[model samples]
Target: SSDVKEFLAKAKEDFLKKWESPAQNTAHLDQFERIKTLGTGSFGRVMLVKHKETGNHYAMKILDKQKVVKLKQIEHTLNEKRILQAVNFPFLVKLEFSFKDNSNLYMVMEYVPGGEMFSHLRRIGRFSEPHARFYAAQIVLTFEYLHSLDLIYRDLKPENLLIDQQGYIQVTDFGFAKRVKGRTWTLCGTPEYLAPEIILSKGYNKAVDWWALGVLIYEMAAGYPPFFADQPIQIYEKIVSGKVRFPSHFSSDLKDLLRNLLQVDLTKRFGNLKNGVNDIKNHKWFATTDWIAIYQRKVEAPFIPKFVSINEKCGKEFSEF
Candidate 1:
């Protein structure tokens, strides 16, 4: 009950203070036992590890330092490390501890015991309006918090959102996220979810993330992204066109919110305009949203993870398609 008040007065230094015990503060790779590998790519991989003393599980990301250096991702990697280490938002992923060796860099984080939002959305085809609202609100609060710190979650999509046991969203993959006080030019993000300004290389801001949210909400509610194409270039063409065709079933309020968010003109975009994030939090579709309750994580989420996993320790995270 007191979590709200204590957290409300929080500062960056207190972010990881929740782990009071030395057992929970292990900063070495040998302190934990690896349970399984979560995902892998050219740079490195993620693994599920269990702390021997506390019996708690965490996602340990191991990156090959050589690849990180050679791929020209040094800046992004450091930025992600700094951002993750300093943030404390419910919907956003939390970093437990970080350590490094000559060959690798490791970041241990809480293991969300569910699955990626992509797999869930794919399995269900589409979420109902209420369901979509719950997920969208999570992203809203995440963006608000990140933007409040001058951070931009440049990459926002189902693939990067994980569902926890509570059914709330946990945003991961800060590889594309950054801190910018004004504007920065970076051609990063998924094809279908790319903001128009990003495609135009017009030095974008946090507004680009808001644009991605509009696409995310539409994709969740309509079963497909507003812009559909067989190729990235085609998708880019469609995004720059700024013509979104809504499903006949979408409600007017939802449509209006999307139109405002997906506005090609940055000055007119909901979150980018004069009202800032309030434009989104106060939108008609979020009429029933209790902003305080959301930040406090008091509202009941609409879905819980029920899928079985080989570990049986928890449902599979970053599961197969």
Candidate 2:
């Protein structure tokens, strides 16, 4: 019955009740004050907020119901909230609370302060192999969790991911995600990160995520996407053709994994988490990771980045760059 939950009229009503008008002090809009805008996208705006009792800082992502409906993103929003509520991962952005206002729905989740990973990647020009490996490994685990729940994060890109307080990657922006019920066919996600099946509108499932992982890894290793183009059609052609050319400086093992992952055949992709994350632990990249320690958050993370001040301006966007 849980997977059967659809992003329908009933789901919208439930979303309002759960996030719009919450019980007492738990998720009520009146409980926290929206301090400032953390970021904004087509569907919603993330705001800095404070918990009245706990006095804890959290980013409340407010999604406009009318805007979502107008954009025909009702299902995407519903699936996003549902997926967050059901999933529990430390590396993953946790949904602390959800409610809605008269015009927009509010999602109060754990605020990872360092800002978008896209900015971080840009700040460093690009990530080193070790740095990229660490982040990719963490994302692999998060995807494992999502797949276990039968969900697919159709959108996977630097902008859609966040660097948390500990500098760990927090997967955010689920507006394009959907449950992998049976099989699906849709042309969604950022063009560069879009899998071949998606670009072709052919039926696809979780394997699409693996392809994205390859794209993300390639982008991190290189300064840009493997298939870069100003025109959407050109990007689609490159993605469908799997014309990803990596640098000679890259290691052979990583290249091998990337090739296997970007195989384009849904039936032959690596790993599965349909029930939860499986087989990924066996990957060569994660072979030396202390799985137990990593899960317990006992091991020290490779990076420590400070949270940008709340008053800091969200400078020039990549879209303009």
Candidate 3:
């Protein structure tokens, strides 16, 4: 009993040393109160939680321990926490605290009240050229920083991106992200955004992200992905075929950049080319983007999300943790 107490006391001291804030904060799971649901995940629902004392809000990502192992996603679940804790990019979501109950795991993440970027895009069929450029520029900056860190965000879709009150993009949902450990093989990505290599079940690297960026750029301007069809297998075939028919309204400059990003050849992909990410950053379509100013978050966003002040009176209906 004495040995167990000593070990726990040493662990608690180490944990507190890694955290910032609150004079007497012990980082206990019960310190937060459940508020409302933010979104749903494969294992559980992401809830907006409030700190009982400071009233600070956070997103609580809960995963049932049984479901995690049964779904064969134990590695993915842990990887999300490991990567989030390791990276410090402003565009990436932050994991503030983590702990576990007997039955589940908790990831206390920073809460972004603005809903998914997909919601806004769904409401409006597509974005105007400049509007899409604004968002795309931010994403480009995000990718550049991530690539510099040797990380690849395997999932890059509007549904996984969040816009804060200021309209800057905050990429979320790192379930499929990892470092570039040589050429990796994992057939995982949204059907519409799958790169040629991924669909072919070939070993791939960060080039897959560039291909998905091309799809994202197309989807934002065209209101639908470049290679979409009724079925996923059909989409896969279309992706592997490498046929992207652009609308007549697309400008030559936009098409050129799209072509480079959607290249089937790994060496030909925009970000993978000799100039690297700068090649994409310097494309004519982004002629007006001051990338340095953007990376510093000093540039003004084209749209600021109008926040609907949520009353704290709302609640969550769930069993106590």
Candidate 4:
């Protein structure tokens, strides 16, 4: 009993020494009151929680360390925490605290009220070009910032993007994220969004994100992913085939943008090419976008989500189990 107490005391002291400079402090799980289950997945569940003292709401993610190890994702899980601590951007979700028990890890983050973009997209069917344009612009900035920090957001999908109370993007979930200078060979990410290089076992870089952006933009405008199949392997086949068929009613500018973004040749992909993100910003479809205003979050979003609190509507949204 004495040895366990000593070990925990030493751990707290070590954490204080390392985390003092980062403005993070150790906190107990009992500090927050669990309100509702926000979401669940293979590893664990995220709950909407309120701080007992401040009464402020937050999302507390509980991760099972045993499941993480069993899935051979120990490094990736560590990288997620590392990146969350290392980076801060307007569109990125804020991590308030992280601590661990012997069997699980906990992450406390900002509670975004608007919920997942995936649910909204599914409900709305599809977005108009202008609506899609607004969201895409924000995503472009997100990619640019992450790449500037030499990090690759391998997983970029509607499900991973959260809408905040201000109707702005809040990028979440860094499970597959990694810091890469050149290329990585990990075959990760959703099947529909996978780049050709990634599917074909070729080393890939940030170019994969641009390809996913193409898919995301397409889905936003078309209501479905460019590649679709019942099975993941079938989706991979379509991705490798590199055939994207746009509707006849789609505009030339939008088609041109998707064409460049979805280019199978990494060297030719819109953001991966010579001009890089500038090429995307300068494209005809985004000609009206004010890059400066977008960066400063001054651009007005096409739609504002209803701010639902934990006790009201979000409690119904959370899962029963």
Report every candidate's CA lDDT. 0.81, 0.71, 0.79, 0.81
lDDT of 1: 0.81
- Ten-residue stretch with the least lDDT total in model 2: 312-321
Error of 2 at 209 (Å): 0.6
TM-score of each: 0.87, 0.80, 0.85, 0.85
lDDT of 1 by residue, 57-150 (tens): 9988887776776787776776677677777778888788886654667788888778898999999999999999988998997887777667
lDDT of 2 at 145: 58
* Pairs with steric clashes in candidate 4: none
Off by over 4 Å in 1: 1-26, 307-321
RMSD of each: 7.8, 9.0, 10.3, 11.1
Please report how far candidate 1 places residue 160 from its true position, in Å. Answer: 0.5
Candidate 3's C-alpha runs over 4 A off are: 1-26, 308-321
TM-score of 4: 0.85
- TM-score for candidate 3, residues paired by index: 0.85
Which candidate would rank higher by TM-score, 2 or 4?
4
Q: Write the per-residue lDDT of candidate 3 for residues 119-226, one digit (tens) a residue.
A: 988987888888888888888877776665567899999999988887888988888988765788888888999898987876889888888999999999989889
Report the C-alpha lDDT of model 4 over 1-321, residue by residue, as the tens digit.
365357446644543453334433357788989899988966799999999999999988887766776777666676677677666668989788876654567788888778688999999999899888989999998887777666799999999997777788889888888877888898888898998889889688988899999999999999999999999999999988888899876799999999999999766789977676889998999999886687788988888887511232222212110
Error of 2 at 192 (Å): 1.2
